[PDB]
Every structure is written in C-alpha cells, then in structure tokens.
Amino acid sequence: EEGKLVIWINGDKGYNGLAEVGKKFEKDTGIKVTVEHPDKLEEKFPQVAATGDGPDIIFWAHDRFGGYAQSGLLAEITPDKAFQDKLYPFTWDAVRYNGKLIAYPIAVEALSLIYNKDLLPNPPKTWEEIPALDKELKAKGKSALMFNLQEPYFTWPLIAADGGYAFKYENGKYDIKDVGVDNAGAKAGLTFLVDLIKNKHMNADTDYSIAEAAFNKGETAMTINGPWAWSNIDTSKVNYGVTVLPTFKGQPSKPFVGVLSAGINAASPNKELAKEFLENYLLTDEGLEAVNKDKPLGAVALKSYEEELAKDPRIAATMENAQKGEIMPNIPQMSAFWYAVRTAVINAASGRQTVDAALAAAQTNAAASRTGLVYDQNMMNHCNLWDSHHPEVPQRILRIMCRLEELGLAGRCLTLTPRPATEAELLTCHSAEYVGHLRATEKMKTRELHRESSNFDSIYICPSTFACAQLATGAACRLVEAVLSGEVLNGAAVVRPPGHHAEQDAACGFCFFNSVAVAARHAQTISGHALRILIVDWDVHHGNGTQHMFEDDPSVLYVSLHRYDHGTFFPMGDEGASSQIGRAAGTGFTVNVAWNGPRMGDADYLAAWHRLVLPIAYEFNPELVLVSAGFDAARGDPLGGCQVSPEGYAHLTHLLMGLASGRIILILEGGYNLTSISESMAACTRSLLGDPPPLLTRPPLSGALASITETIQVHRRYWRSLR
Ligand SMILES: OC[C@H]1O[C@H](O[C@H]2[C@H](O)[C@@H](O)[C@@H](O)O[C@@H]2CO)[C@H](O)[C@@H](O)[C@@H]1O
Ligand SMILES: CC(/C=C/C(=O)NO)=C\[C@@H](C)C(=O)c1ccc(N(C)C)cc1
Numbered sequence: 001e002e003g004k005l006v007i008w009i010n011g012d013k014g015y016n017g018l019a020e021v022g023k024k025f026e027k028d029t030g031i032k033v034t035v036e037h038p039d040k041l042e043e044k045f046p047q048v049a050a051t052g053d054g055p056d057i058i059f060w061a062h063d064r065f066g067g068y069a070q071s072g073l074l075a076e077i078t079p080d081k082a083f084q085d086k087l088y089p090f091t092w093d094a095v096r097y098n099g100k101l102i103a104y105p106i107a108v109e110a111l112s113l114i115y116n117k118d119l120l121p122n123p124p125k126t127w128e129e130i131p132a133l134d135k136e137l138k139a140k141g142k143s144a145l146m147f148n149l150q151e152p153y154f155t156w157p158l159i160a161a162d163g164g165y166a167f168k169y170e171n172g173k174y175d176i177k178d179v180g181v182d183n184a185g186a187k188a189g190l191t192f193l194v195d196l197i198k199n200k201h202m203n204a205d206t207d208y209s210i211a212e213a214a215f216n217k218g219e220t221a222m223t224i225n226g227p228w229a230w231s232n233i234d235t236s237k238v239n240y241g242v243t244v245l246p247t248f249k250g251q252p253s254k255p256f257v258g259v260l261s262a263g264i265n266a267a268s269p270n271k272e273l274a275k276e277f278l279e280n281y282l283l284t285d286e287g288l289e290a291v292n293k294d295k296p297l298g299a300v301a302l303k304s305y306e307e308e309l310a311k312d313p314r315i316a317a318t319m320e321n322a323q324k325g326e327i328m329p330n331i332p333q334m335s336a337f338w339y340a341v342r343t344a345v346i347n348a349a350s351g352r353q354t355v356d357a358a359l360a361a362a363q364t365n366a367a368a369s370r371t372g373l374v375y376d377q378n379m380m381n382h383c384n385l386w387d388s389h390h391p392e393v394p395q396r397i398l399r400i401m402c403r404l405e406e407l408g409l410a411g412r413c414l415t416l417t418p419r420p421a422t423e424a425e426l427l428t429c430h431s432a433e434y435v436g437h438l439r440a441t442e443k444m445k446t447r448e449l450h451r452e453s454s455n456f457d458s459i460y461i462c463p464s465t466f467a468c469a470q471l472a473t474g475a476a477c478r479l480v481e482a483v484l485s486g487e488v489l490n491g492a493a494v495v496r497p498p499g500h501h502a503e504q505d506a507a508c509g510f511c512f513f514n515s516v517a518v519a520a521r522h523a524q525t526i527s528g529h530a531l532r533i534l535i536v537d538w539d540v541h542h543g544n545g546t547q548h549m550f551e552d553d554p555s556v557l558y559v560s561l562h563r564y565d566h567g568t569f570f571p572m573g574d575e576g577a578s579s580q581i582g583r584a585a586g587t588g589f590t591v592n593v594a595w596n597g598p599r600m601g602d603a604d605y606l607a608a609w610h611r612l613v614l615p616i617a618y619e620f621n622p623e624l625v626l627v628s629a630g631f632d633a634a635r636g637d638p639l640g641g642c643q644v645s646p647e648g649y650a651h652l653t654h655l656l657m658g659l660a661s662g663r664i665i666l667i668l669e670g671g672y673n674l675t676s677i678s679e680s681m682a683a684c685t686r687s688l689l690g691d692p693p694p695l696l697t698r699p700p701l702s703g704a705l706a707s708i709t710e711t712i713q714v715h716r717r718y719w720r721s722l723r
C-alpha cells in the first residue's frame with residue numbers, strides 16, 4: 001500500500017507489455033509493480049476509490065475521467081511545462097477538467113473498417129451496399145460484416161452519421177440539456193442497423209469475442225475494431241486491410257474518439273512514485289513501444305514516437321476516421337449517456353423495443369438516469385374488518401409515501417402510474433382456480449369472508465382484497481417494464497398486501513399474490529428468454545412462497561435471510577432451513593441464511609453480505625435484481641425482534657447496486673412499525689438516487705456468524721466464490 005505500486009488497465013489492451021515496463025522499473029528502483037485487469041473496471045474503480053481502497057493508477061479512455069474528478073477520486077496532476085510540450089496539446093485538453101489536469105494522456109484510439117483482403121479485395125465505401133454484398137457472400141457460406149453489438153461504442157459511428165450526437169458543443173461548454181439521441185440522424189442510423197439484423201444478415205447475439213473469432217477464422221469479410229485488435233489479427237491466418245468507415249446517406253461515419261489515459265488515485269500514498277513511473281518510464285519512446293509491441297496503442301500522444309508510428313497506413317487510417325469523428329466529452333454525465341445508448345441499442349436490435357421508443361427513452365436519460373416510484377392510494381382499501389389491532393394496516397404505505405415527500409425524495413423520483421395485473425401475469429405463478437376463488441370474495445360480506453379467511457394460515461379478507469392484491473402485483477410489473485426498457489435505472493414499489501408468502505394455490509402470511517415472483521417471471525417474458533434474476537429476501541420472515549415457486553429454476557437465484565428459531569418462527573416450517581438448497585437443476589440456487597435468536601443487527605447483516613450474498617450474487621451475475629424489501633427486521637419492529645438501522649438498510653441497498661449494471665427493484669413486503677418502515681424506506685430510496693451511504697456503528701453476533709458460515713458450507717460445492 002505504501003511500499004508497492006498497483007495499476008489497472010482494461011483486458012483488451014496490452015497489459016503484458018505494461019508489465020514489462022513495470023519490470024524494467026522494479027529493477028531500477030526496487031518497487032514491485034503489479035498490473036491486473038479486472039472485469040468492468042470502469043465500474044469497479046469508482047466503487048473502491050470512494051471507500052479508500054483501489055489501485056494506484058487507473059487506465060481508461062478519457063470519457064469517464066470527469067466523473068472520477070467530480071467525485072474527487074483522482075489526484076491533481078502537476079507536470080512541468082517541459083514535459084507538457086512532450087505531448088500534443090489536444091491530448092492534454094481531453095484530460096483537462098475544471099481547470100486542473102486529472103490524467104496523463106497516452107494514445108488516441110478510433111474505430112476503423114478492418115477487412116479481409118482476400119474474400120473482399122474491394123471494401124464498400126457505403127453502409128447501404130452491405131446487405132446486397134452479404135447476399136453474394138452468404139451463398140459461399142461466409143458472412144459480410146460482424147462486430148460487437150453489446151457495446152454502444154461500436155454502433156455509434158453509424159448513429160452519428162446522418163446527424164446523431166450526444167451533448168451539443170458550443171464555445172467551450174457542453175449543454176447538458178441539449179441531447180441529440182432521438183433526433184432524425186440518430187433514428188435513421190439505428191433504424192438501418194436493426195434492419196440488418198431484421199434480415200438475417202447480422203445476429204444480435206454477436207459480441208466482441210464472437211465477432212473477433214469470426215474475422216480471425218476468415219469467415220467474415222469486414223469487422224469494426226480499434227488498433228488493439230490488430231495484434232490478434234496478425235497471428236491469425238488472415239490478410240487484412242484497414243481503411244475508412246463506410247458512409248451512411250452519403251455521410252462519413254463519425255466514431256467517438258477516445259484517449260487512453262492514466263490517472264492517480266487520490267487515496268494513493270504513492271503519488272510521487274506514480275508520477276515517476278508514468279512520466280519517466282511509460283511516456284517515453286521506450287516505454288510506449290513496449291506496450292505497443294503487445295497491443296497497438298494507435299496514435300500515441302508522445303510527439304517523438306508518434307512520428308515513427310505515423311508511417312503506418314493503418315494508423316493513418318485510424319487518423320482518418322478520428323478526424324471525421326468527434327472527440328468524446330469528459331463531462332461526468334458520460335456514464336449515464338453510455339448506459340442509455342447501451343440499453344436502447346440492445347432493446348431495439350432485439351425486437352423488444354422499437355427505434356422510436358428506445359431512442360425516446362434514452363433521450364430522456366442521457367444527462368442522468370432516473371429512479372422510478374410506483375404507488376397507489378387505493379391499495380389502502382384492503383383492511384381487517386374484525387381486528388383493528390392487526391399490524392398489516394393501510395397506514396403502512398401512506399406513512400412511507402408521506403415521509404418520502406417530507407424529505408423531498410419523492411419529487412426527485414420519476415413517479416410511475418400503476419395498473420392492475422393482467423390475467424396472464426397472475427396465471428404465470430398462480431392457478432386459475434385460486435385466482436377465481438379470490439376474485440369471488442369481492443362480493444362476499446363480513447360473515448362469509450370470516451369463514452373464508454379461516455381457510456388459510458394467518459389471513460384476513462375484505463371486499464377490497466382482490467383489487468388491492470391485483471394492484472400490488474401489477475404495480476411491480478409496471479416497474480419491471482420501466483427498468484427493462486430504459487425508462488428508469490432502478491425503482492421502488494410501495495405496495496400492499498405483501499406477497500412473498502403466497503403459494504400457487506393458497507394464501508398465507510398476509511399474502512395473496514406473490515408480486516415479486518410474478519414480476520420475476522414477467523421480466524423473462526418481455527425479454528423473451530430465461531433472464532437471470534436475483535431475488536434478495538431480507539424480510540424477517542422466510543419467503544416460503546417465493547422459494548417453492550423457483551425451487552427448480554436455475555435462472556432465478558433466490559436468497560433469503562430470516563428468523564428460524566429451529567423451525568419455530570413463522571412460517572413455522574423446516575422449509576427455511578439452511579440445508580434447503582432447492583432441487584433438480586436448481587440445486588444451489590436456493591440460499592437460506594437462518595437466524596437462531598433475536599437482536600440480529602447491522603453488523604450481522606453486513607457480515608452475511610460480504611461473506612455470502614455478494615460473492616454468490618456476483619458469480620451468478622444477474623441481469624436484474626428484485627428485492628423482497630420487507631422492513632420487519634428493522635429496529636423497533638414489534639414482530640421481528642431485530643435491530644437493523646435505516647443506515648444499515650441504505651448500505652445493504654447501495655451494495656447491491658453493483659449488480660446487474662444497477663438494475664434493482666425494491667418491492668415492499670413486511671414491516672409493521674410505521675416510523676421504522678418509513679425511515680428505512682427513505683434511507684433506501686436515498687441510496688437508489690445515487691446519494692452516498694451514511695456512516696455506521698457493535699460487533700457481529702456469534703450465533704449469527706455460526707448461522708452464516710453454516711449455509712456457505714452447504715453451498716461451497718456449488719459456488720466457486722465460496723471456496
Ligand atoms: O461501449 C461504451 C464504452 O465506450 C468506450 O469504451 C471503449 C474503449 O474506449 C475502448 O478502448 C475499448 O475498451 O472498447 C470500449 C468499448 O467496449 C468508452 O470509453 C466507455 O466509457 C463506454 O462505456
Ligand atoms: C404472519 C406474520 C408475518 C407476516 C410477515 O411479515 N411476512 O413477511 C406474523 C404473525 C405470525 C404474527 O406474529 C402476528 C402477531 C400479531 C398479530 N396480531 C396482533 C393481529 C398477528 C400476527
């Protein structure tokens with residue numbers, strides 16, 4: 001930490017060549033330089049940098065660096081004017097933010113039309129030729145064009161062709177409120193891309209690895225990639241040329257030009273050493289050549305070595321595309337921009353969403369991603385007719401919303417309008433028999449309802465009970481549709497009655513329709529395949545209904561922490577035991593952390609999060625996160641006997657946001673202390689809105705730690721993150 005020097009750089013670059021520079025630096029001064037390449041490190045770095053941890057030196061394109069600087073995660077760079085002249089002036093401007101410098105420039109990288117020179121000696125200079133050109137090749141069992149579709153960076157040069165742009169630039173300023181994502185040029189651009197996939201030319205499944213292996217095996221005429229790719233293309237038995245990007249509507253393609261940059265972490269005590277390595281060991285003709293021999297950097301920022309590299313007709317072709325395109329903005333809103341376009345492209349190019357709809361949703365979130373709120377006051381109609389002392393009261397959801405408005409959190413959200421669940425939605429998790437039974441209760445009276453209520457375990461029914469349960473589930477499904485279509489990033493569904501106890505053909509524990517489960521299955525239908533879903537049930541009671549509903553499903557990872565009391569705590573079974581790991585092909589996808597005894601608190605739940613939940617969750621890698629967010633495990637709750645603070649819930653929430661690219665949906669379950677649940681829900685909503693987690697306090701209970709490790713033992717043979 002003070003005697004070392006660790007550096008991060010993306011896996012597509014030449015990290016091995018950088019290690020060699022770290023070896024010729026370790027030998028010179030004695031300091032060991034370790035270079036690792038984490039996945040999704042542009043997301044990983046701002047996580048650790050905030051909480052003091054992280055690498056000494058960060059490597060990435062300049063577009064992300066302004067976000068890091070706005071959070072004060074980067075150290076200010078102070079090079080003398082002598083070294084300043086050593087690079088091109090336009091590269092320094094890319095890493096200049098709010099006056100200060102915040103990174104060392106390394107190389108300029110722009111996309112190019114790499115193409116096979118054998119199967120296709122003449123590269124089409126227009127995008128419009130490609131479908132016809134694919135016809136002539138698809139007969140010979142060969143494709144025409146394949147490139148990465150899972151990242152918006154690769155399809156952007158086509159979107160920007162006819163007039164699409166991110167944020168408008170005038171003078172020195174970027175107008176956050178001026179976005180050209182849903183304008184004609186951008187729409188015409190993506191429309192043409194989707195049509196390629198519409199007509200069986202390109203496949204939507206195509207990613208970086210698939211597309212590279214296709215071109216390298218000589219079964220794809222053209223591809224789109226950066227200088228870094230060239231190295232792998234050489235070893236390949238493929239003769240390749242690099243030229244200008246094809247035109248769209250007679251317009252030159254405009255790729256988003258990026259600059260490979262190196263920043264110093266603010267928490268690094270090794271700053272001076274950081275300055276020494278980057279300036280006098282990396283940014284030299286010798287150092288830059290070491291990396292470039294591994295993977296081509298492109299057009300480097302260093303004047304001396306650039307003159308040598310500029311003889312390359314490929315680098316010249318890289319400069320041609322870069323000049324026709326535009327240099328990426330460094331403003332801290334780029335992260336929200338790239339996520340919007342990523343969602344829009346994936347959605348539209350699949351068939352789920354349309355060009356008009358997808359771009360319209362992205363247009364609204366280029367500046368910042370929104371958080372959705374969904375709630376209906378009519379859900380208060382469901383009430384107990386013979387017992388006013390029952391804890392599941394209509395005041396539960398009102399007190400929450402009323403508190404969200406007091407703190408002004410509700411206004412900072414994008415309030416979604418709910419709707420009843422369609423018959424199809426409910427039939428995915430509940431039988432038509434049980435649904436009909438429950439709808440029949442609508443026209444019963446208090447006497448008939450009493451006998452009807454005694455048919456189930458811990459249930460009260462009133463004439464409104466069907467409309468409310470139908471609304472709670474339908475509301476959560478609306479939230480699903482919102483997140484999965486780029487309307488929001490994450491959201492909260494303040495609803496009642498609860499649902500995680502509801503079985504397929506039976507009501508139980510104040511539940512009728514399992515809203516979380518229906519939402520899970522619903523999410524998989526609108527995507528059209530078995531989407532990977534994570535369900536975290538941090539309610540103080542075990543969600544027996546949810547577990548049984550996905551007991552054999554390996555596409556839905558269900559995690560639950562709850563009072564067990566040796567099978568005595570409600571719902572009273574052994575179904576919530578730690579040894580219950582699901583069955584069949586879903587074995588290992590049912591995780592039960594079972595508490596023995598009361599007073600489980602913050603330190604207890606945080607222990608489980610770091611030792612079990614997060615490792616398993618990350619290995620599972622969900623594409624959507626649903627939370628049975630009951631707050632009866634909270635402090636001051638009359639039923640749960642636990643002491644989790646609102647500050648604690650905020651941390652648990654904020655920690656789960658690193659999953660599924662931040663796609664989370666908190667759906668309310670239990671919680672019966674009006675002040676405790678409204679406070680906890682507010683603290684959670686704060687975390688969802690990007691607000692920083694508060695400070696905390698109180699060692700882990702021993703019996704809790706016993707409980708935790710007890711269930712990792714049973715799961716250690718099904719999860720490598722537990723080994
Ligand atoms: O796809 C969005 C992505 O675009 C850019 O990332 C590039 C990067 O610049 C290249 O060096 C290489 O790693 O390909 C990446 C895309 O796969 C932006 O730099 C990045 O912020 C953004 O997420
Ligand atoms: C069903 C349940 C938990 C539900 C939940 O929160 N699921 O998530 C708790 C039951 C066992 C309970 O303890 C109880 C206590 C008092 C009471 N009245 C004073 C009316 C009614 C019920």
Ligand SMILES: [K+]
Pocket residue numbers: 537538539540541542543560561562
């Ligand atoms: K639970």
Ligand SMILES: [K+]
Pocket residue numbers: 550551552553554556557558582586589590
């Ligand atoms: K499961």
Ligand SMILES: [Zn+2]
Pocket residue numbers: 539540541630632669670671
């Ligand atoms: Zn509960």
